Description:
This is part of a larger assembly, with two copies of chain A.
Chain A: H1 5-13, E1 17-20, H2 41-55, E2 61-65, H3 74-86, E3 92-93, H4 128-132, E4 141-146, H5 157-166, E5 170-175, E6 183-186, E7 192-195
Parallel strand pairs in A: 1-2, 2-3, 4-5
Antiparallel strand pairs in A: 6-7
The complex binds sodium ion (5 copies).
One sodium ion binds near residues 164, 168, 170 and 171 of chain B.
Family (chains A, B): Belongs to the glycosyl hydrolase 2 family.
Subunit structure (chains A, B): Homotetramer.
Protein name (chains A, B): Beta-galactosidase
Amino acid sequence: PNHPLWYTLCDRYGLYVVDEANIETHGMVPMNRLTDDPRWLPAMSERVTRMVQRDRNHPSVIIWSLGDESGHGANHDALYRWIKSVDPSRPVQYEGGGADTTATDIICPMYARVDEDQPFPAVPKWSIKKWLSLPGETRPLILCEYAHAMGNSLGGFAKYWQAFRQYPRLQGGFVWDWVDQSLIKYDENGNPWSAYGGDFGDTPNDRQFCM
Amino acid sequence: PNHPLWYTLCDRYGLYVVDEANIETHGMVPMNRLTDDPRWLPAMSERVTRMVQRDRNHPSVIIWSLGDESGHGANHDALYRWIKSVDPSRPVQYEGGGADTTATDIICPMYARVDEDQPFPAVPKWSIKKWLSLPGETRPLILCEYAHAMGNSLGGFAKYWQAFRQYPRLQGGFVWDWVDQSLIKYDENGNPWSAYGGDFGDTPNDRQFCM
Lengths: 211, 211
Ligand code: NA
Ligand code: NA
Ligand code: NA
Ligand code: NA
Ligand code: NA
């Protein structure tokens, strides 16, 4: 959840906002080790419930998100239902555990290519066009992230938007992402320059990947 | 309905068959002018009911069809229900009225393209990959007619099969069609040549379209 003024600026200038819980367990092996652990549900539930209690009155918040990159566990199921029960006025989404779990109302993958399937075990990232019509599937698709704008990039962007426009149940996505996370450093002649990972003596680091 | 032997052979040689009532009113304006008329319900009925009575016992008949190019009228609906009621063992498909009406278990377009939409007024021909994912659509897709094999033809046949194989609910189709409907005539030398429409002083005709 963002600094509180953000939602007010969003209400007033007019942007649709996904308000996202402060839960990310990307580093766990497997990604759900904590989110499937009932000992961790209290700590998780606070982070989800307290966002709603704070943010439920902002018109700009149209979708509640259960967190990010934390696999899929019974805790996610539990909190989804809490949100549905507490705030029926908003769909809940979550990318974790396959992007189409019992825990999301929107098929919201990250980096699911337009035409090409990527048949990863357990968590396949289908081609968005194919994903919609998987047997027994009905929900809409909006990529919670797509088109990694890292360095010289965004090549193949027009292909998403052509598909967005043709398929009525494809309803867009959120680009990864807005701003470069470079931090100003200064040199010997007192001159600024943009620095990434490991430029602070920090290690292990994932270098230019913050940008 | 075919010569009775056709089914005996399809039983013994192993082919899945679509048995299809003898009803096409293609040339009516609009196409359903009779199939919607309750006074044609008796004559239509017999063509559907007397097929089911004759052919119900053949294992090669896996799907009943209500006819061809006769729009969509209340009679189709009446008769679709009759079969569904008398033979639950086989699904009913019908293409009239935009290929996805209430009188078909199978979305069965004719000449629907893989990727390109043909948004005809009232009866559009969506791309087959798009058709399946349309809001609230659940049914399988199997084109009753595709890849028109007239003359040097069948360009882009590969595009259709990569599609079927990629999309689980794209379950193939029936090519149009098996055999050139040409007839033998004889010249001054008693030598045999292939004739099409027009070649019998028959007029009006649709020329080589019979092939
Ligand atoms: Na769309
Ligand atoms: Na990054
Ligand atoms: Na298939
Ligand atoms: Na003519
Ligand atoms: Na023809």
